[PDB]
Write an enzyme that holds these catalytic residues in place. Structure first.
Site, short mmCIF file in Angstrom:
data_model
loop_
_atom_site.label_atom_id
_atom_site.label_comp_id
_atom_site.label_asym_id
_atom_site.label_seq_id
_atom_site.Cartn_x
_atom_site.Cartn_y
_atom_site.Cartn_z
N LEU A 94 82.13 17.45 -3.64
CA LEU A 94 80.70 17.19 -4.00
C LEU A 94 80.64 16.36 -5.07
N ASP B 176 99.73 29.03 23.53
CA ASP B 176 100.27 29.09 22.29
C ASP B 176 101.53 29.88 22.30
N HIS C 106 105.34 28.29 21.31
CA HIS C 106 105.96 28.61 20.27
C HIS C 106 107.61 28.72 20.76
N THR D 46 95.58 29.12 14.01
CA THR D 46 94.48 29.88 14.80
C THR D 46 93.77 30.44 14.06
N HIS E 216 103.06 24.76 14.96
CA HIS E 216 101.84 24.13 14.38
C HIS E 216 101.20 24.51 12.96
N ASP F 168 92.11 25.64 20.02
CA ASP F 168 92.07 25.54 18.44
C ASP F 168 92.93 24.73 17.76
N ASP G 38 94.22 29.21 23.15
CA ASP G 38 95.14 29.09 21.95
C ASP G 38 96.26 27.99 22.21
N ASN H 156 85.87 19.31 -10.13
CA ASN H 156 85.80 20.66 -9.82
C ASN H 156 86.44 20.62 -8.40
N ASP I 284 84.78 14.04 -8.91
CA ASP I 284 84.96 15.40 -8.38
C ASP I 284 86.15 16.07 -9.02
C1 LIG Z 1 80.22 22.72 3.68
O1 LIG Z 1 79.41 23.48 3.89
C2 LIG Z 1 78.87 24.52 2.97
C3 LIG Z 1 77.58 25.40 3.68
O2 LIG Z 1 76.60 24.56 3.54
C4 LIG Z 1 78.87 23.94 1.82
O3 LIG Z 1 78.80 25.29 1.03
C5 LIG Z 1 77.92 25.73 0.11
O4 LIG Z 1 77.88 24.83 -1.19
C6 LIG Z 1 76.71 25.24 -1.95
C7 LIG Z 1 76.75 23.95 -3.03
O5 LIG Z 1 77.78 24.42 -4.05
C8 LIG Z 1 76.79 26.64 -2.50
O6 LIG Z 1 75.34 26.64 -3.08
C9 LIG Z 1 75.05 27.75 -3.56
O7 LIG Z 1 75.87 28.79 -3.99
C10 LIG Z 1 75.39 30.12 -4.52
C11 LIG Z 1 75.01 30.94 -3.71
O8 LIG Z 1 76.24 31.76 -3.14
C12 LIG Z 1 75.94 32.61 -2.32
O9 LIG Z 1 74.97 32.65 -1.24
C13 LIG Z 1 75.25 31.90 -0.15
C14 LIG Z 1 74.03 32.16 0.72
O10 LIG Z 1 74.23 33.26 1.73
C15 LIG Z 1 76.55 32.33 0.68
O11 LIG Z 1 76.73 31.36 1.80
C16 LIG Z 1 77.80 32.17 -0.36
O12 LIG Z 1 79.07 32.62 0.33
C17 LIG Z 1 79.98 31.83 -0.50
O13 LIG Z 1 80.61 32.94 -1.57
C18 LIG Z 1 80.96 34.10 -0.66
C19 LIG Z 1 81.59 35.12 -1.84
O14 LIG Z 1 82.78 34.38 -2.66
C20 LIG Z 1 82.04 33.95 0.08
O15 LIG Z 1 82.58 35.09 0.81
C21 LIG Z 1 81.96 32.70 1.18
O16 LIG Z 1 83.06 32.46 1.92
C22 LIG Z 1 81.25 31.45 0.40
O17 LIG Z 1 82.26 31.09 -0.31
C23 LIG Z 1 82.45 29.46 -0.50
O18 LIG Z 1 81.44 28.93 -1.44
C24 LIG Z 1 81.33 29.33 -2.73
C25 LIG Z 1 80.50 28.63 -3.64
O19 LIG Z 1 79.12 29.64 -3.34
C26 LIG Z 1 82.88 29.07 -3.34
O20 LIG Z 1 83.10 29.52 -4.62
C27 LIG Z 1 84.07 29.55 -2.37
O21 LIG Z 1 85.43 29.51 -2.68
C28 LIG Z 1 83.74 29.18 -0.98
O22 LIG Z 1 84.00 27.84 -0.99
C29 LIG Z 1 77.55 33.17 -1.63
O23 LIG Z 1 77.68 34.65 -1.11
C30 LIG Z 1 74.34 29.57 -5.69
O24 LIG Z 1 74.43 30.50 -6.69
C31 LIG Z 1 74.47 28.30 -6.10
O25 LIG Z 1 73.75 27.97 -7.20
C32 LIG Z 1 74.26 27.41 -4.77
O26 LIG Z 1 72.69 27.30 -4.50
C33 LIG Z 1 76.78 27.62 -1.14
O27 LIG Z 1 77.16 28.83 -1.59
C34 LIG Z 1 77.93 27.02 -0.19
N1 LIG Z 1 77.86 27.84 0.82
C35 LIG Z 1 79.08 28.31 1.70
C36 LIG Z 1 78.88 29.01 2.75
O28 LIG Z 1 80.25 28.00 1.31
C37 LIG Z 1 79.98 23.18 1.45
O29 LIG Z 1 79.64 22.67 0.05
C38 LIG Z 1 80.02 21.95 2.46
N2 LIG Z 1 81.32 21.32 1.95
C39 LIG Z 1 80.97 19.69 1.98
C40 LIG Z 1 82.34 19.33 1.52
O30 LIG Z 1 80.00 19.23 2.16
C1 LIG Z 2 87.98 34.32 14.42
C2 LIG Z 2 89.55 34.28 13.97
O1 LIG Z 2 90.47 33.94 14.96
C3 LIG Z 2 90.39 34.97 15.97
O2 LIG Z 2 89.99 35.98 16.12
C4 LIG Z 2 91.42 34.77 17.14
N1 LIG Z 2 91.05 35.58 18.31
C5 LIG Z 2 91.71 36.78 19.01
C6 LIG Z 2 93.18 37.00 18.32
C7 LIG Z 2 91.30 37.28 20.01
C8 LIG Z 2 90.11 36.72 20.60
O3 LIG Z 2 89.69 37.47 21.36
N2 LIG Z 2 89.33 35.89 20.12
C9 LIG Z 2 88.16 35.21 20.32
C10 LIG Z 2 87.84 34.23 19.33
C11 LIG Z 2 86.78 33.31 19.22
C12 LIG Z 2 86.83 32.71 18.35
C13 LIG Z 2 85.52 31.86 17.90
C14 LIG Z 2 84.70 31.68 18.93
CL1 LIG Z 2 83.21 30.55 18.82
C15 LIG Z 2 84.94 32.52 20.09
C16 LIG Z 2 85.93 33.18 20.35
N3 LIG Z 2 88.85 34.34 18.50
C17 LIG Z 2 89.82 35.22 18.84
CA LIG Z 3 82.28 18.09 -7.76
ZN LIG Z 4 96.16 29.24 17.80
ZN LIG Z 5 100.74 29.48 17.40
#
Ligand SMILES: *[C@@H]1O[C@H](CO)[C@@H](O[C@@H]2O[C@H](CO)[C@@H](O[C@H]3O[C@H](CO[C@H]4O[C@H](CO)[C@@H](O)[C@H](O[C@H]5O[C@H](CO)[C@@H](O)[C@H](O)[C@@H]5O[C@H]5O[C@H](CO)[C@@H](O)[C@H](O)[C@@H]5O)[C@@H]4O)[C@@H](O)[C@H](O)[C@@H]3O)[C@H](O)[C@H]2NC(C)=O)[C@H](O)[C@H]1NC(C)=O
Ligand SMILES: CCOC(=O)Cn1c(C)cc(=O)n2cc(-c3ccc(Cl)cc3)nc12
Ligand SMILES: [Ca+2]
Ligand SMILES: [Zn+2]
Ligand SMILES: [Zn+2]
Ligand SMILES: *[C@@H]1O[C@H](CO)[C@@H](O[C@@H]2O[C@H](CO)[C@@H](O[C@H]3O[C@H](CO)[C@@H](O)[C@H](O)[C@@H]3O)[C@H](O)[C@H]2NC(C)=O)[C@H](O)[C@H]1NC(C)=O
Ligand SMILES: [Cl-]
Ligand SMILES: [Cl-]
Ligand SMILES: [K+]
Ligand code: NA
Length: 783
Positions: A669, A260, A264, A158, A416, A307, A120, A665, A663
């Site tokens: 993308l 870390d 600090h 972190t 940081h 990190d 860290d 929204n 873009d």
């Molecule tokens: C970086 O990479 C990621 C991963 O490839 C890209 O994110 C993906 O973007 C696509 C395109 O929009 C999106 O596509 C489909 O979305 C839904 C299906 O969503 C559900 O199922 C998937 C599969 O398991 C799951 O990953 C999703 O998780 C998201 O939502 C949950 C619940 O809110 C969150 O806990 C989780 O953190 C994810 O949140 C992110 O994504 C949503 C959009 O889905 C945002 O609103 C949110 O704020 C956050 O950004 C979900 O459970 C489907 O209906 C739709 O039609 C598409 O087919 C993917 O869902 C999305 N995946 C992830 C993991 O984010 C991203 O675009 C890349 N970025 C760049 C800049 O290239």
């Molecule tokens: C995931 C949000 O941040 C943490 O949980 C910080 N952290 C703390 C507090 C204790 C600890 O034992 N770990 C270990 C990892 C870890 C993270 C990524 C990968 Cl690939 C391998 C190890 N991160 C933590």
């Molecule tokens: Ca867009």
């Molecule tokens: Zn840290």
């Molecule tokens: Zn710190």
């Protein structure tokens, strides 16, 4: 029954065990669920962590933290210095370096285990304190594969960065957008302290330990309760590596809260920093000595990774919102090295963010933060597409803090969190082992790329993430990923002169090929979505014109070191000519621009750089035209007229690809048509939210850009298309005093532009696709 169970024969078990049963694993303390005797059986401390001479050949005392008895080697129980103290062996660090060409593993090891050693707050420049301070880490760094630094994600804290490390995802996608967060749909608050963070609803994506398990590769527990001492973490990993073949994990993680913590307290350049740095190196040495004792030191891949970095930040450099805003007790601020603002009462109807932002914009000449609506933040940060990211954000200047009021403010000298291109925020990467290269330095890269590599190192198929799979193939001796070019989805037309000037009434008045070889240096960009577009050739430039969006998707031209800049003649100021290659229904019209009192227009290829007086007339084609606010035109014109030629002069020519980005929204993308929210007044010409340029030349700057043999050199920007220059506090002055500063802030990767445009660049080159992928992930940071 519950706590009254025992950990005998279960210390640091990898069994999944849940209530009411008591646990004996890595995290039981964090859940207050350990058996009553976990501490005395599993956290043994007696006699310290090192064998002494008087202990060699001892009778095993099970009370000792580690053992120096004869049997200890076959039990995995030895102190890590046992063979040095008792069997005439050398410390790993004292051993001469030798290339590990193939894994040298004992029988039963199907693959090289992966050990992730995360530290860290390990600022990249701590590495410069070298073998004097950190001999074990220096041997890892000098014998293995290292980068000069690794770029973290924003915010450079972190929890966002370690979950990014584990998932390959930007924080806006995996959900951990801060160490503290408020989710307005949950109406709940995530904090480092307390229990809420253990709820799975916060954590998105698919982290490495889950990817591995779901694909049949066993992981040790990556996480460690803070009371488990580091020596015990090392001994536990080593004991797991001694397990039988049918139980032994393939991937492991160690974590250290240092440096870390001391960073600090003492700041990154405090003399107190040597001692945590020495302690970490000792822990690295214990691991490597242990692996040597196991005959695994030429069998394991080790990743030494931070990190984020650490900057000098003290109480004396705090900005207070109460100097700008009247009622700061009505807002909640995530404070410190970044700012996130929301009303203290959720959904409070009197919350007035446009008035808040106004009072925070350029109000002091030495102002040490800048307010942004999150969609206006630099796109490279990828910090907007999540409900947990407040609309109002403050980017804080390096070395400063922001706080609500002085009643909130000495004890700390470092911190940081800043913009992830700030040098003090950069962190470390070292790869050591059979699959990494030997004695190799690689360019700095972003931590989002590592999840694909760790998957490669484990034989795993990565879940969808934001890395560019293959851009890190050059770190690896083998197990490389063979990337394959994406397939064009829409092919271009090559229209001729299907029309005549009489077929056009667009309200535009004007008072008066082998281009591919010179202007399209790396092939045409492939269009990876379903659309309709034309290639248009010109003496000075080429373009891919879209019949759907009424403007080029991309414009491409080359500018030589010796080219001349010329003015626009006064009779050609308002000249726009119809393009006799393109239908009237697939063209913009100048009437809409005459009607829209707030919108003007500009040109993608700049009239200022045309080769001849004749050629310049191509620059005024309606198909070279894009909608631009007068405020943006102040930037774009200065770019076209001054900076492009300055770049050509400095890089021995440059190739430029420019275009629009939509873009609305703010999800990073390419927008579908339904998502475009603004059009030129009373017309169907969509208004871009951003404009991009990709500027390429020869890495060997002695060869001209258009006659380059080897590797390429690239810088790019994604500029926000905004109706004012409020972001630039010096914009009342001449453009020479502020435009380049603005562009530096909105630097971008080609890959960013590809996500935003649906285009794929650099498809025709004399370079490997892997090298090109590296080029597309490059960020020119100007630090
Ligand atoms: C970086 O990479 C990621 C991963 O490839 C890209 O994110 C993906 O973007 C696509 C395109 O929009 C999106 O596509 C489909 O979305 C839904 C299906 O969503 C559900 O199922 C998937 C599969 O398991 C799951 O990953 C999703 O998780 C998201 O939502 C949950 C619940 O809110 C969150 O806990 C989780 O953190 C994810 O949140 C992110 O994504 C949503 C959009 O889905 C945002 O609103 C949110 O704020 C956050 O950004 C979900 O459970 C489907 O209906 C739709 O039609 C598409 O087919 C993917 O869902 C999305 N995946 C992830 C993991 O984010 C991203 O675009 C890349 N970025 C760049 C800049 O290239
Ligand atoms: C995931 C949000 O941040 C943490 O949980 C910080 N952290 C703390 C507090 C204790 C600890 O034992 N770990 C270990 C990892 C870890 C993270 C990524 C990968 Cl690939 C391998 C190890 N991160 C933590
Ligand atoms: Ca867009
Ligand atoms: Zn840290
Ligand atoms: Zn710190
Ligand atoms: C943005 O900054 C403004 C200052 O630049 C701040 O305005 C201040 O607001 C208070 C109350 O809203 C005003 O009123 C007090 O003082 C005057 C006498 O000058 C009286 O008329 C009032 O009744 C009251 O006593 C301040 O005068 C005013 N200051 C200035 C210089 O105009 C805004 O409140 C800030 N806005 C936000 C959203 O924080
Ligand atoms: Cl945060
Ligand atoms: Cl919060
Ligand atoms: K106008
Ligand atoms: Na301004």
């Amino acid at each position: 029954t519950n706590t009254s169970g025992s950990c005998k024969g279960r210390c640091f078990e990898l069994q999944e065990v849940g209530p009411p049963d008591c646990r004996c694993d890595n995290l039981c303390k964090s859940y207050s669920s350990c058996c009553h005797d976990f501490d005395e059986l599993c956290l043994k401390t007696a006699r310290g962590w090192e064998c002494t001479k008087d202990r060699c050949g001892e009778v095993r005392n099970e009370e000792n933290a580690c053992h120096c008895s004869e049997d200890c080697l076959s039990r995995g129980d030895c102190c890590t210095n046992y063979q040095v103290v008792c069997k005439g062996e050398s410390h790993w660090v004292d051993d001469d370096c030798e290339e590990i060409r193939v894994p040298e593993c004992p029988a039963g090891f199907v693959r090289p285990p992966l050990i992730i050693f995360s530290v860290d707050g390990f600022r990249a420049s701590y590495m410069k304190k070298g073998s004097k301070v950190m001999p074990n880490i220096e041997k890892l760094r000098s014998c293995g594969t290292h980068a000069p630094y690794m770029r973290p994600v924003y915010p450079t804290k972190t929890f966002p960065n370690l979950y990014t490390l584990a998932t390959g995802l930007y924080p806006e996608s995996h959900g951990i957008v801060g160490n503290s967060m408020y989710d307005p749909v949950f109406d709940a608050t995530f904090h480092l302290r307390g229990r809420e963070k253990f709820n799975h609803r916060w954590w998105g994506g698919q982290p490495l330990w889950i990817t591995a398990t779901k694909q049949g590769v066993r992981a040790g527990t990556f996480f460690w309760s803070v009371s488990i001492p580091h020596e015990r973490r090392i001994l536990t990993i080593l004991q797991w590596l001694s397990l039988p073949d049918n139980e032994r994990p393939s991937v492991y993680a160690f974590y250290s809260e240092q440096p870390d913590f001391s960073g600090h307290k003492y700041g990154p350049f405090g003399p107190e920093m040597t001692n945590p740095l020495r302690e970490i190196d000792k822990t690295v040495g214990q691991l490597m000595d242990g692996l040597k004792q196991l005959k695994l030191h030429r069998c394991v891949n080790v990743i030494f990774v931070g990190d984020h970095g650490m900057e000098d930040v003290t109480c004396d450099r705090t900005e207070f919102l109460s100097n700008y805003l009247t009622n700061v007790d009505d807002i909640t601020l995530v404070p410190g090295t970044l700012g996130r603002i929301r009303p203290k009462i959720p959904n409070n109807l009197k919350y007035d963010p446009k008035a808040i932002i106004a009072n925070l914009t350029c109000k002091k000449p030495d102002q040490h933060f800048k307010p942004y609506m999150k969609q206006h933040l630099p796109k490279r940060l990828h910090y907007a597409n999540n409900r947990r990211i407040e609309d109002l954000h403050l980017l804080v200047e390096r070395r400063w803090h922001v706080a609500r009021k002085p009643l909130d403010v000495c004890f700390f000298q470092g911190d940081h969190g800043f913009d992830n291109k700030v040098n003090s925020m950069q962190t470390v990467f070292v790869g050591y082992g059979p699959t990494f290269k030997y004695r190799t330095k690689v360019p700095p890269f972003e931590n989002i790329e590592l999840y694909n590599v760790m998957c490669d190192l484990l034989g795993l198929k990565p879940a969808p993430n934001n890395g560019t799979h293959g851009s890190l193939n050059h770190l690896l001796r083998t197990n490389t990923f063979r990337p394959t070019l994406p397939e064009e989805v829409s092919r271009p037309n090559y229209p001729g002169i299907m029309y005549l000037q009489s077929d056009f009434d667009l309200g535009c008045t004007c008072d008066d090929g082998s281009t591919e070889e010179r202007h399209l240096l790396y092939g045409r960009p492939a269009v990876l979505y379903r659309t309709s577009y034309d290639i248009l050739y010109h003496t000075d430039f080429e373009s891919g014109y879209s019949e759907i969006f009424l403007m080029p998707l991309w414009t491409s031209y080359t500018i030589s070191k010796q080219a001349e800049v010329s003015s626009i003649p006064e009779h050609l100021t308002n000249c726009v000519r119809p393009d006799v290659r393109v239908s009237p229904g697939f063209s913009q019209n100048c009437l809409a621009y005459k009607n829209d009192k707030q919108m003007s227009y500009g040109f993608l290829f700049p009239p200022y750089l045309s080769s001849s007086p004749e050629a310049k007339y191509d620059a005024f084609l309606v198909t070279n035209m894009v909608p631009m606010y007068p405020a943006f035109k102040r930037v774009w014109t200065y770019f076209q007229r001054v900076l492009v030629k300055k770049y050509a002069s400095e890089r021995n020519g440059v190739n430029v690809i420019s275009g629009p980005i939509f873009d609305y929204n703010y999800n990073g993308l390419r927008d579908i048509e339904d998502e475009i929210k603004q059009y030129v007044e009373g017309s169907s010409i969509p208004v871009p939210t951003h404009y991009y340029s990709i500027i390429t030349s020869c890495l060997d700057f002695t060869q001209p850009a258009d006659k380059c043999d080897g590797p390429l050199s690239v810088s790019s920007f994604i500029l926000p298309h905004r109706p004012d220059n409020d972001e630039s506090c010096n914009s009342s002055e001449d453009e020479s005093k502020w435009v380049e500063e603005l562009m530096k802030m909105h630097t971008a990767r080609v890959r960013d532009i590809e996500h935003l445009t649906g285009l794929d660049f650099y498809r025709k080159t004399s370079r490997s696709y892997s090298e090109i992928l590296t080029l597309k992930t490059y960020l020119h940071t100007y630090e």
